[PDB]
Design a protein around this nucleic acid. Sequence first.
DNA 1: GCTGATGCGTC
DNA 2: GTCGGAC
DNA 3: GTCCGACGACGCATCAGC
Length: 637
Amino acid sequence: SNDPSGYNPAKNNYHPVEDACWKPGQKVPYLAVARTFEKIEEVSARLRMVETLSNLLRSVVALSPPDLLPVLYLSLNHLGPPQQGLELGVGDGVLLKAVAQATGRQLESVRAEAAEKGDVGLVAENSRLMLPPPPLTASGVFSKFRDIARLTGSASTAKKIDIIKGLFVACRHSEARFIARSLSGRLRLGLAEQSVLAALSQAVSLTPPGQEFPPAMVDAGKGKTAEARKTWLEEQGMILKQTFCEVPDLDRIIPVLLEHGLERLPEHCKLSPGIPLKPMLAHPTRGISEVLKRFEEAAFTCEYKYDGQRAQIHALEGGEVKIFSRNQEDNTGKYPDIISRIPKIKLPSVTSFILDTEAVAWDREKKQIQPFQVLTTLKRKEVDASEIQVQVCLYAFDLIYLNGESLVREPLSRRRQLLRENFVETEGEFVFATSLDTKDIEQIAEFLEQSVKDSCEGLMVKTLDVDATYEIAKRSHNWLKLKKDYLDGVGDTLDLVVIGAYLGRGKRAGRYGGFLLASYDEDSEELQAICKLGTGFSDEELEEHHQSLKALVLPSPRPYVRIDGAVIPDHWLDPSAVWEVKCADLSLSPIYPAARGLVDSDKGISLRFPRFIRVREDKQPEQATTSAQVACLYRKQ
DNA sequence: GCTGATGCGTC
DNA sequence: GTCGGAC
DNA sequence: GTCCGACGACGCATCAGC
Ligand SMILES: *OP(=O)(O)OC[C@H]1O[C@@H](n2cnc3c(N)ncnc32)[C@H](O)[C@@H]1O
């Protein structure tokens, strides 16, 4: 049948058996996957991407079920289940070395072209005494990626380069483009987890697994009205999405899906302590008015938004405790102190639970929350080891599971009541998030002010009874986050000088994707780098920046511009442009020189979450925010 | 082994 | 983390 | 609203060049 180079999963009236490019029972060719990625990359309509991926997956299900799992992971650019912690350990540097070797070019030449094009894939693809090696297969490429991720220790980079070179030598057509993009962590299809799930549920709905070959049912949706088909696929999609959000692990879900089908899947893969789940997320909301409009017909609660790290705390029946990050990373080992206090935070009647909390640094002498930067510096504190002044404190804000019962479909009013009834607070150790139930604008505004005075970032807002569940599948950003620095005109902005630009990648290829900013150190008469900047401009504004900063490019840096440890710009810029920049906090920096010596001996100051607001056309660089002003902003935190 | 660089997680 | 583009 | 991928500071385990 068909050579894979001609595979077209975007064709009208795609037939999963007749339009595939491999025979039943054989390994899915990687070129089939690459061709699907091509047809996805070529469009901007996400629903067209889903249809195209679904066509590939239908053929995988019909012909080669064992390759469904690797094909899905390749489509997500995942190495496996997130809690297993697999990491390629391949940066652009190592990848470029492998490309240079495979293409027979000097490294600097490949590096410069990759920076200019904004994409390593284009260099690997568009850049033989031996006949080709066997064609790449989807499962074979996936296992090679996992081989790369497993390599560790001295000389491991050399072994990784050998695997990558081996892949590139076997590539044809567009394969090297997507293998290089995968290895760089930037597959950039425009299609990610939500679209992959929609494609998968559509595929197994239209082309059910488990059919003796050839499958008699290849397009089950076909004969329905447009409305009935849409409703049916939505319902099937929700079955998969709700299961995935409770058990975000394709290693678990896919074998069940293939053996038992989608309808039975929830009976086999269930929320359970010890298995990380997807956390509820929050939509940014730029003011109280937007909150009220969003929750127009629903009573809601406001809670302090604590400035720490999420900690999903699992207590299994029998006493084992596990702690997971918001991205399902196993964090159990960072918190032995916490784990030994679990019998202290729960009533004796609690036999199992899943808590949603923020881990925060707490200074027990000052009795106050410390900045996130302090928290990330805390070393693990063994129980029976000597006590230190600052410790991790949990601020609990949700209860997902209790005594063998999932609370995912319960309204927050009930989950919060069970949380408050069944758990016990200890200052500096385990505390319920401070909250207020109101619709009064002035009360909300005063509560927002108080959260900031109490060392928090702002407010989380959550409905209590209407659309108030923990069902990520229904709405992943079911909560709202309201920060003072979202309010334009509110909070501290800086006027900073653009001293450098960085070539853009991906969506920014062909212009500047980032910029190096500086404050003005009056005492030493120098500009000091303070942060980089890569968000806040519209596409049109970024085009304007590219055009006006192009003219200011210098071959060699000005001698009064100090950047110390900052990334050297691709283009140094005549210090001229002054931009208004907003941030959330100021941090003590290990690399930036701004205001060094004014607050800390060895460290300058940088900006947390900086973003572009507007050009200060009226201001000259001498009128930029000074480094003394930067120190003033830091101290008043 | 020493030293500086960095991939990748957190936010 | 923030942000804006495509739908 | 939803989904996606541009881009930020920073800590550190672990890497390569000697
Ligand atoms: O900015 P963001 O989308 O990452 O915000 C969500 C995160 O905020 C943290 N957090 C802190 N305090 C709360 C409360 N009270 N409720 C919910 N989330 C909260 C979480 O870590 C969350 O990921």
